[PDB]
Each structure stands twice: as C-alpha cells, then as structure tokens.
Amino acid sequence: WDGEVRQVSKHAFSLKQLDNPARIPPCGWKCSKCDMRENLWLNLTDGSILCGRRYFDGSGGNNHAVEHYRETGYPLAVKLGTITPDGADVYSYDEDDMVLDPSLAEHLSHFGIDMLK
Ligand SMILES: [Zn+2]
C-alpha cells in the first residue's frame, strides 16, 4: 500500500482493452487455471484472473499469469486485493517490473471496478 516511486509504464497510455469484459467482483477471486485464492493477478487487457509466478525459493503462485503472458503478449496486470481508492500494485511483464499506470482508474473502470472500493 504505497511506499515507493515506480516508473510510468510505456504501455499505460496506449493500453488496448478488449471488448465485452467480464465484471470483476471486489472479493473472492480464484485462478481460472488452478485452486489458488491468493496472489491473483487481473490482466488489464483481457480481464483474465491468474496466479502469481513461482519464485526460485519455492514461494509464490503457479506461474499461470506469466504463462498467459507468454501466449498473449498482454503486458499489464494488477494484483487483486491491492486496489485501494488511491492506487494498486501494477506489474509489467514486458518491462519486468512494478510500474505506475496513470490511467489505472479508467483501465479498472473497464471491468466495473470503481476505485472507491
Ligand atoms: Zn493458477
């Protein structure tokens, strides 16, 4: 919940969001490919909800979000459960780093997510 100065993603301004997005609820998500209910990521382009990467120390999720990225090339994803009226944790697979999306409000609105949780 804040505490750093992340750079603006080069994809933020021109991020393309597919039509007919699902309505993403404010709680109770699950990776669409496994049983994880924590460390889930919503891809800002197609609205897929998938678990975080597996770290080399064995922690983390089951790599479903990253595997999804390798197939679609959709760069941005926001961590569900980190979205507060002020911001959220946004990750860019392309730039391999946490980033700032100045158009997050709009990008989340696309999924029926009002940043006034
Ligand atoms: Zn998963």
UniProtKB/Swiss-Prot annotation:
Residues that, per the record, bind substrate: 41, 53-56, 91, 93, 96
Subcellular localization is given as:
Cytoplasm; Cytoplasm, Stress granule; Nucleus
Q: Where are the zinc fingers (UBP-type)?
A: 7-115
Residues given in the record as Zn(2+) binding sites: 31, 34, 51, 64
Impact upon substituting residue 34 to A: Decreased rate of activity
Modification after translation is described as:
Ubiquitinated by SMURF1; leading to proteasomal degradation.
Q: Could you name the domain of life of the organism this protein comes from?
A: Eukaryota
Q: What is known of its domains?
A: The UBP-type zinc finger domain interacts selectively with an unmodified C-terminus of the proximal ubiquitin. Both UBA domains are involved in polyubiquitin recognition.
Function of this protein?
Answer: Deubiquitinating enzyme that participates in a wide range of cellular processes by specifically cleaving isopeptide bonds between ubiquitin and substrate proteins or ubiquitin itself. Affects thereby important cellular signaling pathways such as NF-kappa-B, Wnt/beta-catenin, and cytokine production by regulating ubiquitin-dependent protein degradation. Participates in the activation of the Wnt signaling pathway by promoting FOXM1 deubiquitination and stabilization that induces the recruitment of beta-catenin to Wnt target gene promoter.
Q: Quaternary arrangement and interactors, per the entry?
A: Homodimer. Interacts with TRIML1.
Q: What else is known?
A: The UBP-type zinc finger domain crystallizes as a dimer linked by a disulfide bond between the Cys-27 residues of both molecules, but there is no evidence that the full-length USP5 exists as a dimer.
Family, according to the entry, reads as follows: Belongs to the peptidase C19 family.
Please identify the protein, giving its name as recorded.
Answer: Ubiquitin carboxyl-terminal hydrolase 5
List the source organism.
Homo sapiens (Human)
This chain is encoded by the gene named USP5
